[PDB]
């Protein structure tokens, strides 16, 4: 009965690991900012956001070419493909662009923060910063958290806009559907406040979880060159489970 | 040590379930099986989307597929080959007398035998040798047609029966037909 | 004109980097196996495959609950939801289960191989193994490559089977559609050799790219405790771009 | 403290195994049968597309 | 009783019969 | 050797474009994959809803 004793010991440490990461979040956001805190947030928007711009724009095109090619092969048997422009822009705006653009943000810019704060912990830069008197949560961690909550909802819109334009390329200009019935099928069925705004609120709840996890794993490492790399797979797995987990809860509320 | 030899052996079991569930509870593999089938064929004047591997019905029951729809460019008419079945559509070992006792019933009737060329045993012996093998349930005055189920579904073939004193033997061309109707047909015929 | 000169120097090293990874693949697969090579492949199927079983089975359920809840909200306006069991099992079998289960394999078991072969390179275990005479490509790398090509197509089937069963739960047993017309809508429209086999061949081309990249990045590191962690984000990004890139090429061929 | 580290082991592995029966029950591969049912019959002349297990 | 036979039926009325009769 | 690496790298990408323009032709999505085609035309009075690539 050791394996059941080891298994129960595993999920007790993972439960108290949540409670440390909850108390770490209440110390960051319940504080008025220190002098100079906006100059570092603009710089941390460059590392997290702007470097992630190339992967999202390219991969957003490749889903749009697939959604236009799969939606045409199904809607041609029933002979109604004036709804092609609807189902492409309805799959992206409420479902795929909130979800897939959080599965690529957890990889590229999610795990990179855990390496960045993690390598500062093994090389004692975090411990050296505290003896000077500077608190490392306000100095290092907090400009990285606020640059994650802002930079992902700005990236699902670029994912959704490039995905529709890419879906317009293979649907209208390669397979040969009508251009005017493509766009006029959108404005009838796709509202703004029910679909585009509910695709943004779905990504703010996703941007909080892919950043609060990816910061806590790099702050509570164990300082070891092979203990860092084991916490970069702990933050890609835990982000992809909370994205798909809060997907169903937010879909049932918004579209139920 | 023995765990890593065992916890892979479980992983092949859970793959084994979830592959068997796909083939024989989701995909159509268990439902398609031609029970000792053969092949007949026909010629149509319109096949507007009769997709291959469709279904053929006699009375609203699946007794056949579709295999090839090519043109006949000496008449510019269609050519469809459908494989029916040999247990749902033909007369089996005991059933061979049921069509000779029906050939003697309505076909070899004396008021029917006295309506043709004069003999005593010409057709009377032919109904014992022609009717024994190479014979289906389809009476030869049954003309195949294209139909569709509902108003969105695919095209399927329908064999409307009736009458019939000889049966179609094997590989035979079904006599009459009618094409499928759509908007270019109906409103030009509704007047 | 330095930034243009630095940008051209970046993509020349990334082109040469492909040519090293191509010559590394021809040395692994063009060799008859050494004595004892099957005993390590069964063990490496435990690390890559069996440890990845929990994330795929749980996340496969959460997509099925979403596909049943979104497909019902659209198909109830047109009033035809005997096609609910078709579009759920057609979205998974040909499109989502080959793609999403490769975006979670690149994270969990993809990047873990790059940490595993990467930490053997900085701590000189690879250099020490060669002086004994044992070739580290045949000894260490090659049981990890063949355990990646096998373990992913066994995992997209478990992803697709759990996704349909999960979609049957929220469609039939919670929203109230007919159970018999759910299953009988599947066997009419979903073939085996055109849909289930073409969803497996799509994942063998995906399992080759998420493993040959994730092995090469951990073999050609630069030995440095913060040079390993920069090559674990290079292998999540490059895998997610080749999954979505070979998606459109394989979809156009199979369903065009 | 071992009873605390082992109560969580069982309470997980109940939930991990009882959830396999519920996922095997709703897949239709186990059971799916009525209570003391019977079987009538009727004979039609044209069942236009009446697949089995329809209501 | 159980196992018996209902014998009063009618068949399906399909559109290839209906629309051609609707003329 | 580095040059060798380079080469064996320009040969993968060039082969990677040879596949993308094979699988785009056999898909039907570009070019004309129907043999020895000859062209005819006609004169209508009203052709609604008729794009190219029709049947």
mmCIF file with all atom_site columns, N, CA and C in Angstrom, chain C residues 32-84:
data_model
loop_
_atom_site.group_PDB
_atom_site.id
_atom_site.type_symbol
_atom_site.label_atom_id
_atom_site.label_alt_id
_atom_site.label_comp_id
_atom_site.label_asym_id
_atom_site.label_entity_id
_atom_site.label_seq_id
_atom_site.pdbx_PDB_ins_code
_atom_site.Cartn_x
_atom_site.Cartn_y
_atom_site.Cartn_z
_atom_site.occupancy
_atom_site.B_iso_or_equiv
_atom_site.pdbx_formal_charge
_atom_site.auth_seq_id
_atom_site.auth_comp_id
_atom_site.auth_asym_id
_atom_site.auth_atom_id
_atom_site.pdbx_PDB_model_num
ATOM 1   N N  . UNK C 1 32 ? 20.332  -1.537 -38.963 1.00 0.00 ? 32 UNK C N  1
ATOM 2   C CA . UNK C 1 32 ? 19.735  -2.693 -38.315 1.00 0.00 ? 32 UNK C CA 1
ATOM 3   C C  . UNK C 1 32 ? 19.992  -2.590 -36.816 1.00 0.00 ? 32 UNK C C  1
ATOM 4   N N  . UNK C 1 33 ? 19.022  -2.967 -35.976 1.00 0.00 ? 33 UNK C N  1
ATOM 5   C CA . UNK C 1 33 ? 19.097  -2.603 -34.555 1.00 0.00 ? 33 UNK C CA 1
ATOM 6   C C  . UNK C 1 33 ? 20.137  -3.418 -33.806 1.00 0.00 ? 33 UNK C C  1
ATOM 7   N N  . UNK C 1 34 ? 20.742  -2.786 -32.805 1.00 0.00 ? 34 UNK C N  1
ATOM 8   C CA . UNK C 1 34 ? 21.745  -3.418 -31.961 1.00 0.00 ? 34 UNK C CA 1
ATOM 9   C C  . UNK C 1 34 ? 21.057  -4.383 -31.007 1.00 0.00 ? 34 UNK C C  1
ATOM 10  N N  . UNK C 1 35 ? 21.835  -5.289 -30.420 1.00 0.00 ? 35 UNK C N  1
ATOM 11  C CA . UNK C 1 35 ? 21.310  -6.284 -29.497 1.00 0.00 ? 35 UNK C CA 1
ATOM 12  C C  . UNK C 1 35 ? 20.868  -5.622 -28.201 1.00 0.00 ? 35 UNK C C  1
ATOM 13  N N  . UNK C 1 36 ? 19.601  -5.810 -27.850 1.00 0.00 ? 36 UNK C N  1
ATOM 14  C CA . UNK C 1 36 ? 19.023  -5.165 -26.692 1.00 0.00 ? 36 UNK C CA 1
ATOM 15  C C  . UNK C 1 36 ? 18.181  -3.960 -27.028 1.00 0.00 ? 36 UNK C C  1
ATOM 16  N N  . UNK C 1 37 ? 17.943  -3.705 -28.316 1.00 0.00 ? 37 UNK C N  1
ATOM 17  C CA . UNK C 1 37 ? 17.233  -2.508 -28.721 1.00 0.00 ? 37 UNK C CA 1
ATOM 18  C C  . UNK C 1 37 ? 15.739  -2.552 -28.509 1.00 0.00 ? 37 UNK C C  1
ATOM 19  N N  . UNK C 1 38 ? 15.166  -3.737 -28.318 1.00 0.00 ? 38 UNK C N  1
ATOM 20  C CA . UNK C 1 38 ? 13.736  -3.817 -28.061 1.00 0.00 ? 38 UNK C CA 1
ATOM 21  C C  . UNK C 1 38 ? 13.418  -3.664 -26.584 1.00 0.00 ? 38 UNK C C  1
ATOM 22  N N  . UNK C 1 39 ? 14.369  -3.968 -25.706 1.00 0.00 ? 39 UNK C N  1
ATOM 23  C CA . UNK C 1 39 ? 14.118  -3.808 -24.286 1.00 0.00 ? 39 UNK C CA 1
ATOM 24  C C  . UNK C 1 39 ? 14.063  -2.357 -23.859 1.00 0.00 ? 39 UNK C C  1
ATOM 25  N N  . UNK C 1 40 ? 14.716  -1.475 -24.613 1.00 0.00 ? 40 UNK C N  1
ATOM 26  C CA . UNK C 1 40 ? 14.685  -0.059 -24.274 1.00 0.00 ? 40 UNK C CA 1
ATOM 27  C C  . UNK C 1 40 ? 13.514  0.641  -24.942 1.00 0.00 ? 40 UNK C C  1
ATOM 28  N N  . UNK C 1 41 ? 13.011  0.085  -26.042 1.00 0.00 ? 41 UNK C N  1
ATOM 29  C CA . UNK C 1 41 ? 11.872  0.692  -26.714 1.00 0.00 ? 41 UNK C CA 1
ATOM 30  C C  . UNK C 1 41 ? 10.594  0.476  -25.919 1.00 0.00 ? 41 UNK C C  1
ATOM 31  N N  . UNK C 1 42 ? 10.490  -0.658 -25.227 1.00 0.00 ? 42 UNK C N  1
ATOM 32  C CA . UNK C 1 42 ? 9.323   -0.905 -24.385 1.00 0.00 ? 42 UNK C CA 1
ATOM 33  C C  . UNK C 1 42 ? 9.350   0.008  -23.169 1.00 0.00 ? 42 UNK C C  1
ATOM 34  N N  . UNK C 1 43 ? 10.542  0.302  -22.657 1.00 0.00 ? 43 UNK C N  1
ATOM 35  C CA . UNK C 1 43 ? 10.640  1.214  -21.527 1.00 0.00 ? 43 UNK C CA 1
ATOM 36  C C  . UNK C 1 43 ? 10.384  2.652  -21.955 1.00 0.00 ? 43 UNK C C  1
ATOM 37  N N  . UNK C 1 44 ? 10.815  3.021  -23.161 1.00 0.00 ? 44 UNK C N  1
ATOM 38  C CA . UNK C 1 44 ? 10.623  4.398  -23.605 1.00 0.00 ? 44 UNK C CA 1
ATOM 39  C C  . UNK C 1 44 ? 9.197   4.639  -24.067 1.00 0.00 ? 44 UNK C C  1
ATOM 40  N N  . UNK C 1 45 ? 8.428   3.572  -24.241 1.00 0.00 ? 45 UNK C N  1
ATOM 41  C CA . UNK C 1 45 ? 7.013   3.712  -24.535 1.00 0.00 ? 45 UNK C CA 1
ATOM 42  C C  . UNK C 1 45 ? 6.258   4.046  -23.254 1.00 0.00 ? 45 UNK C C  1
ATOM 43  N N  . UNK C 1 46 ? 6.846   3.718  -22.107 1.00 0.00 ? 46 UNK C N  1
ATOM 44  C CA . UNK C 1 46 ? 6.244   4.058  -20.827 1.00 0.00 ? 46 UNK C CA 1
ATOM 45  C C  . UNK C 1 46 ? 6.370   5.547  -20.543 1.00 0.00 ? 46 UNK C C  1
ATOM 46  N N  . UNK C 1 47 ? 7.549   6.119  -20.775 1.00 0.00 ? 47 UNK C N  1
ATOM 47  C CA . UNK C 1 47 ? 7.788   7.524  -20.467 1.00 0.00 ? 47 UNK C CA 1
ATOM 48  C C  . UNK C 1 47 ? 7.021   8.454  -21.398 1.00 0.00 ? 47 UNK C C  1
ATOM 49  N N  . UNK C 1 48 ? 7.073   8.183  -22.699 1.00 0.00 ? 48 UNK C N  1
ATOM 50  C CA . UNK C 1 48 ? 6.453   9.042  -23.700 1.00 0.00 ? 48 UNK C CA 1
ATOM 51  C C  . UNK C 1 48 ? 4.952   8.802  -23.760 1.00 0.00 ? 48 UNK C C  1
ATOM 52  N N  . UNK C 1 49 ? 4.552   7.551  -23.939 1.00 0.00 ? 49 UNK C N  1
ATOM 53  C CA . UNK C 1 49 ? 3.153   7.236  -24.122 1.00 0.00 ? 49 UNK C CA 1
ATOM 54  C C  . UNK C 1 49 ? 2.296   7.226  -22.876 1.00 0.00 ? 49 UNK C C  1
ATOM 55  N N  . UNK C 1 50 ? 2.649   6.387  -21.900 1.00 0.00 ? 50 UNK C N  1
ATOM 56  C CA . UNK C 1 50 ? 1.748   6.088  -20.787 1.00 0.00 ? 50 UNK C CA 1
ATOM 57  C C  . UNK C 1 50 ? 1.609   7.291  -19.860 1.00 0.00 ? 50 UNK C C  1
ATOM 58  N N  . UNK C 1 51 ? 2.670   8.084  -19.723 1.00 0.00 ? 51 UNK C N  1
ATOM 59  C CA . UNK C 1 51 ? 2.585   9.288  -18.904 1.00 0.00 ? 51 UNK C CA 1
ATOM 60  C C  . UNK C 1 51 ? 1.733   10.358 -19.580 1.00 0.00 ? 51 UNK C C  1
ATOM 61  N N  . UNK C 1 52 ? 1.613   10.295 -20.906 1.00 0.00 ? 52 UNK C N  1
ATOM 62  C CA . UNK C 1 52 ? 0.785   11.252 -21.626 1.00 0.00 ? 52 UNK C CA 1
ATOM 63  C C  . UNK C 1 52 ? -0.673  10.836 -21.688 1.00 0.00 ? 52 UNK C C  1
ATOM 64  N N  . UNK C 1 53 ? -1.035  9.720  -21.068 1.00 0.00 ? 53 UNK C N  1
ATOM 65  C CA . UNK C 1 53 ? -2.373  9.164  -21.209 1.00 0.00 ? 53 UNK C CA 1
ATOM 66  C C  . UNK C 1 53 ? -3.403  9.959  -20.426 1.00 0.00 ? 53 UNK C C  1
ATOM 67  N N  . UNK C 1 54 ? -2.967  10.636 -19.368 1.00 0.00 ? 54 UNK C N  1
ATOM 68  C CA . UNK C 1 54 ? -3.920  11.303 -18.491 1.00 0.00 ? 54 UNK C CA 1
ATOM 69  C C  . UNK C 1 54 ? -4.372  12.632 -19.072 1.00 0.00 ? 54 UNK C C  1
ATOM 70  N N  . UNK C 1 55 ? -3.454  13.365 -19.704 1.00 0.00 ? 55 UNK C N  1
ATOM 71  C CA . UNK C 1 55 ? -3.792  14.683 -20.234 1.00 0.00 ? 55 UNK C CA 1
ATOM 72  C C  . UNK C 1 55 ? -4.682  14.547 -21.464 1.00 0.00 ? 55 UNK C C  1
ATOM 73  N N  . UNK C 1 56 ? -4.397  13.557 -22.314 1.00 0.00 ? 56 UNK C N  1
ATOM 74  C CA . UNK C 1 56 ? -5.152  13.375 -23.553 1.00 0.00 ? 56 UNK C CA 1
ATOM 75  C C  . UNK C 1 56 ? -6.572  12.899 -23.278 1.00 0.00 ? 56 UNK C C  1
ATOM 76  N N  . UNK C 1 57 ? -6.747  11.972 -22.334 1.00 0.00 ? 57 UNK C N  1
ATOM 77  C CA . UNK C 1 57 ? -8.075  11.437 -22.040 1.00 0.00 ? 57 UNK C CA 1
ATOM 78  C C  . UNK C 1 57 ? -8.959  12.494 -21.381 1.00 0.00 ? 57 UNK C C  1
ATOM 79  N N  . UNK C 1 58 ? -8.390  13.317 -20.498 1.00 0.00 ? 58 UNK C N  1
ATOM 80  C CA . UNK C 1 58 ? -9.165  14.370 -19.856 1.00 0.00 ? 58 UNK C CA 1
ATOM 81  C C  . UNK C 1 58 ? -9.470  15.507 -20.811 1.00 0.00 ? 58 UNK C C  1
ATOM 82  N N  . UNK C 1 59 ? -8.485  15.968 -21.573 1.00 0.00 ? 59 UNK C N  1
ATOM 83  C CA . UNK C 1 59 ? -8.717  17.072 -22.493 1.00 0.00 ? 59 UNK C CA 1
ATOM 84  C C  . UNK C 1 59 ? -9.535  16.644 -23.702 1.00 0.00 ? 59 UNK C C  1
ATOM 85  N N  . UNK C 1 60 ? -9.536  15.351 -24.025 1.00 0.00 ? 60 UNK C N  1
ATOM 86  C CA . UNK C 1 60 ? -10.386 14.873 -25.103 1.00 0.00 ? 60 UNK C CA 1
ATOM 87  C C  . UNK C 1 60 ? -11.850 14.898 -24.729 1.00 0.00 ? 60 UNK C C  1
ATOM 88  N N  . UNK C 1 61 ? -12.136 14.785 -23.436 1.00 0.00 ? 61 UNK C N  1
ATOM 89  C CA . UNK C 1 61 ? -13.512 14.862 -22.971 1.00 0.00 ? 61 UNK C CA 1
ATOM 90  C C  . UNK C 1 61 ? -14.030 16.288 -23.046 1.00 0.00 ? 61 UNK C C  1
ATOM 91  N N  . UNK C 1 62 ? -13.159 17.262 -22.784 1.00 0.00 ? 62 UNK C N  1
ATOM 92  C CA . UNK C 1 62 ? -13.605 18.646 -22.679 1.00 0.00 ? 62 UNK C CA 1
ATOM 93  C C  . UNK C 1 62 ? -13.908 19.239 -24.043 1.00 0.00 ? 62 UNK C C  1
ATOM 94  N N  . UNK C 1 63 ? -13.283 18.715 -25.096 1.00 0.00 ? 63 UNK C N  1
ATOM 95  C CA . UNK C 1 63 ? -13.638 19.145 -26.438 1.00 0.00 ? 63 UNK C CA 1
ATOM 96  C C  . UNK C 1 63 ? -14.946 18.516 -26.881 1.00 0.00 ? 63 UNK C C  1
ATOM 97  N N  . UNK C 1 64 ? -15.203 17.274 -26.488 1.00 0.00 ? 64 UNK C N  1
ATOM 98  C CA . UNK C 1 64 ? -16.446 16.612 -26.821 1.00 0.00 ? 64 UNK C CA 1
ATOM 99  C C  . UNK C 1 64 ? -17.650 17.253 -26.169 1.00 0.00 ? 64 UNK C C  1
ATOM 100 N N  . UNK C 1 65 ? -17.476 17.779 -24.957 1.00 0.00 ? 65 UNK C N  1
ATOM 101 C CA . UNK C 1 65 ? -18.570 18.489 -24.307 1.00 0.00 ? 65 UNK C CA 1
ATOM 102 C C  . UNK C 1 65 ? -18.815 19.839 -24.957 1.00 0.00 ? 65 UNK C C  1
ATOM 103 N N  . UNK C 1 66 ? -17.790 20.419 -25.573 1.00 0.00 ? 66 UNK C N  1
ATOM 104 C CA . UNK C 1 66 ? -17.956 21.682 -26.278 1.00 0.00 ? 66 UNK C CA 1
ATOM 105 C C  . UNK C 1 66 ? -18.557 21.464 -27.659 1.00 0.00 ? 66 UNK C C  1
ATOM 106 N N  . UNK C 1 67 ? -18.127 20.417 -28.366 1.00 0.00 ? 67 UNK C N  1
ATOM 107 C CA . UNK C 1 67 ? -18.631 20.166 -29.713 1.00 0.00 ? 67 UNK C CA 1
ATOM 108 C C  . UNK C 1 67 ? -20.091 19.741 -29.694 1.00 0.00 ? 67 UNK C C  1
ATOM 109 N N  . UNK C 1 68 ? -20.517 19.050 -28.639 1.00 0.00 ? 68 UNK C N  1
ATOM 110 C CA . UNK C 1 68 ? -21.921 18.718 -28.515 1.00 0.00 ? 68 UNK C CA 1
ATOM 111 C C  . UNK C 1 68 ? -22.771 19.895 -28.101 1.00 0.00 ? 68 UNK C C  1
ATOM 112 N N  . UNK C 1 69 ? -22.189 20.849 -27.387 1.00 0.00 ? 69 UNK C N  1
ATOM 113 C CA . UNK C 1 69 ? -22.949 21.999 -26.927 1.00 0.00 ? 69 UNK C CA 1
ATOM 114 C C  . UNK C 1 69 ? -22.993 23.103 -27.967 1.00 0.00 ? 69 UNK C C  1
ATOM 115 N N  . UNK C 1 70 ? -21.990 23.182 -28.837 1.00 0.00 ? 70 UNK C N  1
ATOM 116 C CA . UNK C 1 70 ? -22.012 24.195 -29.882 1.00 0.00 ? 70 UNK C CA 1
ATOM 117 C C  . UNK C 1 70 ? -22.762 23.713 -31.110 1.00 0.00 ? 70 UNK C C  1
ATOM 118 N N  . UNK C 1 71 ? -22.628 22.430 -31.443 1.00 0.00 ? 71 UNK C N  1
ATOM 119 C CA . UNK C 1 71 ? -23.343 21.887 -32.579 1.00 0.00 ? 71 UNK C CA 1
ATOM 120 C C  . UNK C 1 71 ? -24.835 21.788 -32.365 1.00 0.00 ? 71 UNK C C  1
ATOM 121 N N  . UNK C 1 72 ? -25.282 21.734 -31.112 1.00 0.00 ? 72 UNK C N  1
ATOM 122 C CA . UNK C 1 72 ? -26.712 21.731 -30.849 1.00 0.00 ? 72 UNK C CA 1
ATOM 123 C C  . UNK C 1 72 ? -27.296 23.130 -30.942 1.00 0.00 ? 72 UNK C C  1
ATOM 124 N N  . UNK C 1 73 ? -26.524 24.156 -30.587 1.00 0.00 ? 73 UNK C N  1
ATOM 125 C CA . UNK C 1 73 ? -27.054 25.514 -30.614 1.00 0.00 ? 73 UNK C CA 1
ATOM 126 C C  . UNK C 1 73 ? -27.212 26.030 -32.036 1.00 0.00 ? 73 UNK C C  1
ATOM 127 N N  . UNK C 1 74 ? -26.485 25.452 -32.986 1.00 0.00 ? 74 UNK C N  1
ATOM 128 C CA . UNK C 1 74 ? -26.608 25.869 -34.376 1.00 0.00 ? 74 UNK C CA 1
ATOM 129 C C  . UNK C 1 74 ? -27.638 25.016 -35.101 1.00 0.00 ? 74 UNK C C  1
ATOM 130 N N  . UNK C 1 75 ? -27.632 23.707 -34.855 1.00 0.00 ? 75 UNK C N  1
ATOM 131 C CA . UNK C 1 75 ? -28.523 22.807 -35.572 1.00 0.00 ? 75 UNK C CA 1
ATOM 132 C C  . UNK C 1 75 ? -29.946 22.801 -35.032 1.00 0.00 ? 75 UNK C C  1
ATOM 133 N N  . UNK C 1 76 ? -30.249 23.586 -33.999 1.00 0.00 ? 76 UNK C N  1
ATOM 134 C CA . UNK C 1 76 ? -31.628 23.635 -33.529 1.00 0.00 ? 76 UNK C CA 1
ATOM 135 C C  . UNK C 1 76 ? -32.416 24.735 -34.231 1.00 0.00 ? 76 UNK C C  1
ATOM 136 N N  . UNK C 1 77 ? -31.745 25.714 -34.836 1.00 0.00 ? 77 UNK C N  1
ATOM 137 C CA . UNK C 1 77 ? -32.451 26.749 -35.576 1.00 0.00 ? 77 UNK C CA 1
ATOM 138 C C  . UNK C 1 77 ? -32.936 26.235 -36.920 1.00 0.00 ? 77 UNK C C  1
ATOM 139 N N  . UNK C 1 78 ? -32.183 25.332 -37.537 1.00 0.00 ? 78 UNK C N  1
ATOM 140 C CA . UNK C 1 78 ? -32.563 24.777 -38.826 1.00 0.00 ? 78 UNK C CA 1
ATOM 141 C C  . UNK C 1 78 ? -33.365 23.512 -38.572 1.00 0.00 ? 78 UNK C C  1
ATOM 142 N N  . UNK C 1 79 ? -33.426 23.098 -37.310 1.00 0.00 ? 79 UNK C N  1
ATOM 143 C CA . UNK C 1 79 ? -34.367 22.074 -36.898 1.00 0.00 ? 79 UNK C CA 1
ATOM 144 C C  . UNK C 1 79 ? -33.983 20.672 -37.313 1.00 0.00 ? 79 UNK C C  1
ATOM 145 N N  . UNK C 1 80 ? -32.769 20.512 -37.830 1.00 0.00 ? 80 UNK C N  1
ATOM 146 C CA . UNK C 1 80 ? -32.288 19.210 -38.271 1.00 0.00 ? 80 UNK C CA 1
ATOM 147 C C  . UNK C 1 80 ? -31.111 18.796 -37.399 1.00 0.00 ? 80 UNK C C  1
ATOM 148 N N  . UNK C 1 81 ? -31.392 18.043 -36.337 1.00 0.00 ? 81 UNK C N  1
ATOM 149 C CA . UNK C 1 81 ? -30.350 17.595 -35.423 1.00 0.00 ? 81 UNK C CA 1
ATOM 150 C C  . UNK C 1 81 ? -30.348 16.080 -35.324 1.00 0.00 ? 81 UNK C C  1
ATOM 151 N N  . UNK C 1 82 ? -30.776 15.414 -36.386 1.00 0.00 ? 82 UNK C N  1
ATOM 152 C CA . UNK C 1 82 ? -30.363 14.043 -36.611 1.00 0.00 ? 82 UNK C CA 1
ATOM 153 C C  . UNK C 1 82 ? -28.978 13.986 -37.230 1.00 0.00 ? 82 UNK C C  1
ATOM 154 N N  . UNK C 1 83 ? -28.463 15.131 -37.689 1.00 0.00 ? 83 UNK C N  1
ATOM 155 C CA . UNK C 1 83 ? -27.093 15.278 -38.151 1.00 0.00 ? 83 UNK C CA 1
ATOM 156 C C  . UNK C 1 83 ? -26.156 15.738 -37.044 1.00 0.00 ? 83 UNK C C  1
ATOM 157 N N  . UNK C 1 84 ? -26.612 15.744 -35.791 1.00 0.00 ? 84 UNK C N  1
ATOM 158 C CA . UNK C 1 84 ? -25.724 16.108 -34.694 1.00 0.00 ? 84 UNK C CA 1
ATOM 159 C C  . UNK C 1 84 ? -24.655 15.051 -34.479 1.00 0.00 ? 84 UNK C C  1
#
